[PDB]
Design a protein around this ligand. Sequence first.
Ligand SMILES: O=C(O)[C@@H]1CCCC[C@@H]1Nc1ncnc2[nH]c3cc(F)ccc3c12
Length: 167
Amino acid sequence: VNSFSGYLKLTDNVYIKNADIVEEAKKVKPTVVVNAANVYLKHGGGVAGALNKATNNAMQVESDDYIATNGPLKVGGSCVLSGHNLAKHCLHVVGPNVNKGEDIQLLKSAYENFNQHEVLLAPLLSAGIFGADPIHSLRVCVDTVRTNVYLAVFDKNLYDKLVSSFL
Ligand SMILES: O=C(O)[C@@H]1CCCC[C@@H]1Nc1ncnc2[nH]c3cc(F)ccc3c12
């Protein structure tokens, strides 16, 4: 038993809700919140900009030190950093950005990072400003992640299309 509430169950291990991930994180304080990161951990907009704003820019300060030490992530890769006031940990995961011409096959590799964590609160990778089809992203999520994933979908209209079209 865990503290996630109001989710619809899609599969044995995948759950979905219409929610603002920032507010969902603030209330649940999950062990892991996933950020829709880029390779530079520049949290300017989308999910990343919202999460970072909710940390009063502490996520960005920590991220800049991480990059200065380690260099950029790989597309499809991830790193574990602090969850600040939102979660114990933040798993920064880089899905391919279709608006940068990145290979969508890397979306499966991106979701594989979730399997290193028993339970996660997450957005749909490569959705939103990353330019991928959120229905495809949901399919890859279901077919790749084996751990327990609670997906927060900000847009109510999108949440309903994702549910109604789910196979
Ligand atoms: O659902 C959507 O509209 C999109 C799905 C994936 C790409 C961007 C959006 N992502 C999110 N997903 C969950 N919570 C969120 N809070 C947010 C707050 C913001 F200021 C911007 C985006 C989100 C967001």
